[PDB]
Amino acid sequence: VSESGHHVPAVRKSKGRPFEVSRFDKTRPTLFPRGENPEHSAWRLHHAERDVIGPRQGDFPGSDKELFDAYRKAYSKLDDIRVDVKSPNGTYTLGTNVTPSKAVDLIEVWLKGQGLM
Amino acid sequence: MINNKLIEIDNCLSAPSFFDFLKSLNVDSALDSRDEPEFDDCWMSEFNSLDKESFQDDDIEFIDSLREKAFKYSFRVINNAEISSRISDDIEIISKSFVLEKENSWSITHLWSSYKNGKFPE
């Protein structure tokens, strides 16, 4: 197991939704920041999500569609960031060196294939 | 002017090894506990109350610099985005609570006191 701690959608925000995730599930792909100074990419992702989605705690006050739309809005101007999208346990690799926006697309496709939308 | 309590938070966050306790954290257990209603409802109650208040622009700007420090200094220890995000959010509401001089404040007596005692609040 290798962990970035970056679920998209976030664990707390997915609770009760078709794509809910439990933290023991190390198969669900997460985002891993690439490049020099990953703390800054991580901070930029945090701050964009804080601006659009809100606090890490609490429900997301909106539909599944709005929640995915919110990540896409948050990530719209982050195309210079690169992430990997992969399972912490290594079982799936969805993307390598992709933009945060692309990562949302990859996760949506994977969840649909898995029956989780 | 920047509120003196915020300068004190800066001094604490910037102290050597402030976040080293994260090396011993059971991340999944702590976040699971924070996502349960007892903690989550309390946190959101603090957030919702503070969101109705009005803050000076220099304090808000300075709080954003405190969030960045809390995020990045904690990220350097265990490289966990959700932990660092929750610490940043905690520092936001801790800071606002100090500026409002809130007494009996859960943000201060639980969240901030946790950090000062080398623990991730849950």
Out of A12, A24, A43, whose CB is closest to B28?
Answer: A24
Tell me the C-alpha distance between B17 and B20, whole Å. Answer: 5
In chain A, domain spans: 11-113
CB contact under 8 A, B47 and A57: yes
Residue A100 in contact with residue A83, Cβ under 8 Å?
Answer: yes
CA distances from B59 to A36, B45, B89, B100 (A): 31, 22, 15, 11
- The reported resolution of this PDB entry, expressed in Å, is 1.4
CB contact under 8 A, B71 and A38: no
Given the DSSP bridges, would you call strands A83-86 and A30-33 parallel, antiparallel or unpaired? antiparallel
Residue B85 in contact with partner chain A when CB distance is under 8 A = yes
3-state DSSP call for residue A31?
Answer: strand
The maximal CA–CA distance of chain A, rounded, in angstroms, is: 36
Judge whether B67 lies within some domain.
yes
Of B109, B72, B90, the closest CA to residue A56 belongs to B90
- Min Cα separation A113/chain B (Å): 26
Judge whether B36 lies within some domain.
no
The DSSP call for residue A15 is T
- Both structure tokens of A60: 């997301």
Count: domains in chain B: 1
Technique behind this structure? X-ray
Residue A70 in contact with residue A23, Cβ under 8 Å?
Answer: no
